[PDB]
Structure formats: structure tokens, C-alpha cells
A paper describes a structure:
AtBFN2 (also called ENDO2) is a 34.5 kDa glycoprotein (the predicted mass for protein component alone is 30.5 kDa), encoded by the Arabidopsis thaliana At1g68290 gene. AtBFN2 follows the standard glycosylation pattern of plant S1/P1 endonucleases, with three glycosylation sites (Asn91, Asn110, and Asn184). While the P1 nuclease has a higher specificity for RNA over ssDNA, in a previous study we showed that the opposite is true for AtBFN2.
We obtained a ligand-free AtBFN2 structure, as well as a phosphate co-crystal structure in a new unit cell with space group P1. In addition to our improved AtBFN2•SO4 co-crystal structure, we were also able to obtain a new, ligand-free, structure, which was solved from crystals belonging to space-group P 1. In this structure, we found that four water molecules coordinate the tri-metallic cluster. Finally, water four (Wat4) coordinates Zn1.
Numbering used by the authors: 1 to 100, 107 to 201, 203 to 263
Amino acid sequence: WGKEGHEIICKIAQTRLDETAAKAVKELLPESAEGDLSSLCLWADRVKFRYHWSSPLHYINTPDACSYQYNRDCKDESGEKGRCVAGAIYNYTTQLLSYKSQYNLTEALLFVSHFMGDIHQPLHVSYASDKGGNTIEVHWYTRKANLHHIWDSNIIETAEADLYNSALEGMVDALKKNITTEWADQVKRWETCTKTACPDIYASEGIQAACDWAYKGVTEGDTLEDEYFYSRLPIVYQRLAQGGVRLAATLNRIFG
Ligand SMILES: *[C@@H]1O[C@H](CO)[C@@H](O[C@@H]2O[C@H](CO)[C@@H](O[C@@H]3O[C@H](CO[C@H]4O[C@H](CO)[C@@H](O)[C@H](O)[C@@H]4O)[C@@H](O)[C@H](O[C@H]4O[C@H](CO)[C@@H](O)[C@H](O)[C@@H]4O)[C@@H]3O)[C@H](O)[C@H]2NC(C)=O)[C@H](O)[C@H]1NC(C)=O
Ligand SMILES: *[C@@H]1O[C@H](CO)[C@@H](O[C@@H]2O[C@H](CO)[C@@H](O)[C@H](O)[C@H]2NC(C)=O)[C@H](O)[C@H]1NC(C)=O
Ligand SMILES: *[C@@H]1O[C@H](CO)[C@@H](O[C@@H]2O[C@H](CO)[C@@H](O)[C@H](O)[C@H]2NC(C)=O)[C@H](O)[C@H]1NC(C)=O
Ligand SMILES: [Zn+2]
Ligand SMILES: [Zn+2]
Ligand SMILES: [Zn+2]
């Protein structure tokens, strides 16, 4: 996701942390953050070339099909296994199990926070043939955009201005509201994991949603407007709340 999506995810996550996780996160966050996880949840997007080895870790590429398998899909352009957003979540959550060696646990926190968000972007788990939709040029109303960008940013941004009078906390408060009184049963399931993180579950969901909702109906050159916006906004919200809930659930498990 772009900036809004990651904020929303990390804000939600942070208000769902139990006391020990809440403590850990403050201790790992720099003073410049001022205790706010969401201030640094885009940090990973700023180090793709600083740490060139990190850039495959933001997504998963699948063949032209609506499935994800770890052993098949989790790998970078060198074919190196586990070099994908799923493998990264396993790596960085494992490191945070060490919190009380070789690893910067402030980075692991910032990577895990970001990647938990990214694994929930449907187009961060989608076709390598169109690079997760980046090569599908459409218009977002009057502006040229690619399909990937529409899911990273445009949909959230449009809802932000059109249904929440330019206040993001408007939308955060509404996702939070639906977490406790519409989605309560779903949320319990979203939080369940029998490992420390359950990334392949989230990836499988994402590829399903890329196909059912993101790619669906869309042809190169289309103008996506109200109809697409309104029918796809519910899955965007779904995926933000899920990221939010699973990020918190994961840090609670790790630090507990
Ligand atoms: C799990 O999380 C960790 C922590 O973030 C990640 O660890 C990094 O992994 C990358 C590679 O995937 C490492 O980058 C490589 O570093 C090599 C030398 O590193 C030295 O320097 C570092 C810090 O300066 C020290 O750890 C130590 O002194 C090392 O000796 C370079 O030689 C590599 O570059 C060469 O190979 C690459 C291919 O990887 C080529 O592209 C280049 O052209 C070049 O020839 C490379 O840069 C990085 O240093 C690791 N850091 C640490 C702290 O361990 C894991 O990647 C991550 N895994 C996941 C998410 O799956
Ligand atoms: C652990 O990693 C973090 C982030 O990479 C380091 O914090 C950064 O330090 C650099 C270099 O001095 C600064 O320029 C940045 O402003 C800092 N960023 C953040 C987000 O805090 C931290 O110093 C590292 N810990 C080490 C090396 O022990
Ligand atoms: C929170 O959940 C509510 C209710 O399930 C969603 O509101 C419904 O959604 C449609 C748009 O898809 C509206 O036209 C209906 O009028 C709504 N019903 C009610 C009772 O309000 C709402 O959009 C969800 N909000 C978020 C942020 O997820
Ligand atoms: Zn993102
Ligand atoms: Zn993206
Ligand atoms: Zn990213």
C-alpha cells in the first residue's frame, strides 16, 4: 500500500496491542516516532535501494492463475527461496522472538509492520505477467493510473475525500467500529494462527481477491469510476482491517 493504507493498518494494530507488546513496541521505536508505530510504517518503502536485498520482500509473484503456494511462489528473481513478503514476515517475526544478537530489532519491527500491511494488498500477491497490475494502464476517473497504484492508493484516497471529509481518522474509526460490532466473529478467525505468523493464509486470500475483485472486469484502457470504486471499496476495507488485526495479533504473540 501507499502511505494511507499503511497508516490505517498500523494505527489499528497499535490500539489492539496487549500491555507487553505495547511496551516492547515503544522500546523498539525511535524517540523521533514518539511512540506512534504509524509514523514509521512506510519506512520499508524508503530502503528498497539502500538495502537492495529488501525489494523482493514487498510482494509475491504468481503465474497467471488464482493460487498461491509457498514453495512455488516464494522466491526472488534469483530464485532464492523465501525471498518474498511471506518469507519476510517469517524472518522478521522470528527475529523479534529474541527481544528481551546480530539483528536490529527496530528494523525487524518496522519490516514486519510494513510487510504485514503489504501481504494484505491483493495486488502485492498477484500475476508476475503484469507485475502485480503495474503494467495495466487504466484511468482513475480523469487521471491515468495503473491498476496496482489504484489499489495501493487511489481507492483509499478517494474514499478519504468523498466519504470521510478528508479525515483519515474518520475511516480508521469506521474500520475500528466494524471490527468490534459487524466483524467480531471474522476478527477472531483473522487473529488465529497455530505457528507465530500465518502469512500463507493471508497470501492465499490476497490472490483470490486480486482475481475476484482487482483484475475482474478490467481491460487495459478502461476508465474506472464510481461503479468500480463502490464495488471494490468493501474488499479494500476488509484487507485493511485484516492487516490491522493480524499485525496486532502477531506482535502480541511474539512479545507474549
Ligand atoms: C532476514 O532479515 C535479515 C535482516 O534484515 C536480512 O539480512 C540481510 O540479507 C541480505 C542479503 O539477502 C544481506 O545483504 C548481503 O550482504 C553481503 C555482505 O554483508 C556484509 O555486511 C553486512 C552489513 O554491512 C553484515 O551483515 C556482514 O558484515 C556481511 O558480511 C553482500 O555481499 C551481499 O551483496 C552481494 O550479493 C548480493 C546478493 O545478495 C548481490 O546483489 C550484490 O551485487 C553483491 O554481490 C548482500 O548485500 C544483508 O547484509 C543481511 N543483513 C543482516 C544484518 O543479516 C535477510 O535478507 C532477511 N531475509 C528475508 C526477509 O527473507
Ligand atoms: C537500527 O536501525 C535503525 C533504522 O535503520 C537505525 O536508526 C537510524 O539510524 C540512522 C543512522 O544513524 C539514522 O540516520 C536514521 O535517522 C535512523 N532511523 C530511525 C528510523 O531511527 C538504528 O540506528 C539502528 N541501530 C543500530 C545500528 O544499532
Ligand atoms: C461498516 O459496516 C457497515 C455495515 O455492514 C457498512 O455499511 C454498509 O455498506 C454499504 C456500502 O457498501 C452502505 O450503502 C450501506 O448503507 C451500509 N449499511 C449500513 C447499515 O450502514 C460500512 O461501509 C462499513 N464501513 C467500513 C469502513 O468498513
Ligand atoms: Zn505498501
Ligand atoms: Zn504496491
Ligand atoms: Zn511496500
